[PDB]
């Protein structure tokens, strides 16, 4: 394998000519896509990869300076696309990966035919002019709990992030991938995400964006989907689903996979 391919656990599955890239969010890995991948293998070559810092990656590769902003993750994405010789792709970004792909597409819009965002937000912190869902005190509480007992935090946080039954298979899976991260890496990354502010780059986006989220998402109020739709600088469309949870492609695939497939297969009018 190539050096980038190996470092990110890259897989290229399927036999189609066109490319689709599936990019996961915090606390999980490329297995979050397991219910979607089987539906894509004839139409596409499906590119899966893990973000640096996920529990499936080598913690020795986690450069704290490199990843102190989302730009470091966007470089990694562009490096993968370059090594794999992608001409263009549909990019499906979950949670923070929606903004990572957005940043990458501003540097190389030719590589992105469309961006599909799942559970995305350009900013979590409130202020008197913008509702993202969180106050600084909420973050301080979260980070204090993470740092004081990481194992206990994973078990309490997973059911909140996934939503629904606390004993579900999806809660099981997510609690395990959370706890497979090195605690200092997880803490550092979650701080970086929570304090991010991508609002000012949305107007520069030049690739069509499909904005999908659960109607009940603990980290993404529905008004954020409308905010993305308003401020993205080219055509976009919003679909709020009748689901609960931040990883709905994992916890409610019977509802969510058809929605993603629809946005993969149909385009927004120019």
Author numbering: 1 to 270
Question: Which passages does the manuscript contain on this structure?
Answer:
KAI2 proteins are plant α/β hydrolase receptors which perceive smoke-derived butenolide signals and endogenous, yet unidentified KAI2-ligands (KLs). Prior to their diversification, KAI2 underwent duplication resulting in KAI2A and KAI2B. Here we demonstrate that Pisum sativum KAI2A and KAI2B are active receptors and enzymes with divergent ligand stereoselectivity. To further address this point, we determined the structure of an evolutionarily diverged PsKAI2B in apo and a unique butenolide-bound state at high resolution (1.6 Å and 2.0 Å, respectively).
To elucidate the structural basis for the differential ligand selectivity between KAI2A and KAI2B, we determined the crystal structure of PsKAI2B at 1.6 Å resolution. The PsKAI2B structure shares the canonical α/β hydrolase fold and comprises base and lid domains. The core domain contains seven-stranded mixed β-sheets (β1–β7), five α-helices (αA, αB, αC, αE and αF) and five 310 helices (ŋ1, ŋ2, ŋ3, ŋ4, and ŋ5). Nonetheless, further structural comparative analyses have identified two residue alterations in positions 129 and 147 within the lid domain which appear to slightly alter the backbone atoms and generally distinguish legume KAI2 proteins from KAI2s in other species. PsKAI2B exhibits a structural arrangement that results in a larger volume of the hydrophobic pocket (125.4 A3) yet with a smaller entrance circumference (30.3 Å) than PsKAI2A (114.8 A3 and 33.6 Å, respectively). Further in silico docking experiments of (–)-GR24 with PsKAI2B resulted in a successful docking of the ligand that is completely buried in the pocket and positioned in a pre-hydrolysis orientation nearby the catalytic triad. Residue 160 is positioned at the entrance of the ligand-binding pocket in helix αD2, thus the substitution of leucine (L160 in KAI2A) to methionine (M160 in KAI2B) results in modifying the circumference of PsKAI2B pocket entrance. Residue 190 (S190 in PsKAI2A and L190 in PsKAI2B) is positioned in helix αD4 and represents a major structural arrangement at the back of the ligand envelope.
